[PDB]
Structure formats: C-alpha cells, structure tokens
A paper describes a structure:
G88R but not G88E was originally acquired by the virus as a spontaneous compensatory mutation after NLS disruption. M(NLS-88R) M1, similar to wt-M1, is able to switch from a face-to-back monomer–monomer association at neutral pH to a face-to-face-oriented dimeric conformation at acidic pH. The residues Lys104 (part of the NLS motif), Arg134, Tyr100 and Asp94 on the ‘face’ of one molecule (Monomer A) interact with several complementary residues on the ‘back’ of a second molecule (Monomer B), including Glu29, Asp30, Lys21 and Ser17. The face-to-back monomeric arrangement of M1 occurring at neutral pH is likely necessary for the formation and maintenance of a confluent and strong matrix layer underneath the viral envelope, whereas the face-to-face dimeric arrangement at acidic pH may describe M1 that has dissociated from the extended matrix layer. We then determined M1–M1 interactions under different pH conditions by BLI. Regardless of pH conditions, M(NLS-88R) had M1–M1 interactions in a dose-dependent manner similar to wt-M1. Nevertheless, M(NLS-88R) M1 retains pH-dependent conformational transition like WSN. Compared with M(NLS-88E), that M(NLS-88R) has less difficulty to break the fulcrum likely translates into a smaller cooperative energy requirement of monomer-to-dimer conversion under subtle pH changes. This flexibility facilitates M(NLS-88R) M1 to dissociate from vRNP in the acidified endosome, thus prompting virus replication in vitro. Our results also indicate that the compensatory G88R mutation was not a random mutation but was chosen by the virus purposefully to retain pH-dependent conformational flexibility for efficient virus replication.
As the most abundant viral protein encoded by the M gene segment, matrix protein 1 (M1) forms a shell underneath a host cell-derived lipid biolayer to connect the vRNPs with the viral envelope in mature virions. The full-length M1 protein includes 252 amino acids consisting of a highly organized N-terminal domain and a flexible but less ordered C-terminal domain that are linked by a protease-sensitive loop. So far, only the N-terminal domain of M1 has been structurally resolved at an atomic level, showing that at neutral pH the physiological monomers have a high tendency to oligomerize via a so-called ‘face-to-back’ arrangement, whereas at acidic pH the N-terminal domain exists as a dimeric structure in a so-called ‘face-to-face’ arrangement.
Numbering used by the authors: 2 to 70, 77 to 85, 89 to 158
The structure:
Amino acid sequence: SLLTEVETYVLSIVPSGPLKAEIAQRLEDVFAGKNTDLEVLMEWLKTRPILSPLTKGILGFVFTLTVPSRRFVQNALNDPNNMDKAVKLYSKLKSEITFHGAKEIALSYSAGALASCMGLIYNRMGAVTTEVAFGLVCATCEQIADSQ
C-alpha cells in the first residue's frame, strides 16, 4: 500500500502541464504490472521535452526498481561537498531494511545530498533493498518540492 506514497511524491516535482498527464498514466501502468520491456520507458523519458535532467533521473530511478529484470540518469544524479554527506548516509541505509525507517533518516539531510545519494545507489541496485530506495526517493522528492 506504500506504492501510492511514491506516486504522489513524484507527481510533485514534475512541472504542471500536458506532461504531468502523460507521466501519470505511464506510472499507473507499471504500478499495475503490465509493462516488462524496461528499455522502452527509459527511452521514452530521455526524449521527453519538458523534463528536467533531475526529473528524468528520479523517474528513471523509480521505473528501474519496479520492472522485473544508463548514463543519462547517472549524470543527472551525479556539486560541492554534498557528496560527502551522501557517502555516509549511503553506509547507513545499508543497515535499514524498511521504507519508513530510511525515509525518516533521509528527510533529515539536505536536498543536495539526497539527490546525489541516489546516484550512489544506482551503481549498485542490489546493495540496498527496494523499500529503502523508495524511502530515499520519497525523502528526496519532498525536500526539493518544499522550496516554495
């Protein structure tokens, strides 16, 4: 029942318009379990015109964690010392297993460290569990959508 907490949070950073409409459907399709060919929605993201590199990074991060079994996302997630806090946070998320446990800790750090922390996990999608990674996405999305 936590999959909806990722949905609404991701739909908070995407700029309003005819793009939040397209992304909305593509999300609630893989969140129902029909799409399998991972490298289709990946390409679909990369070519979309009103998406910031950061949004393409988070969306690409979420899609990968779903689908059963890229450089344009790594270069979006990863510029001063925010990497320094990310490395230590990354070493902590290994300890945590549940979604809410990591989200509680990740929400306590800067928005810069979180987005870069996601870059660390993308290199190893097996180092940490999925529930935690969602918690990182949820904490990341909220803090960057908390500026205004």
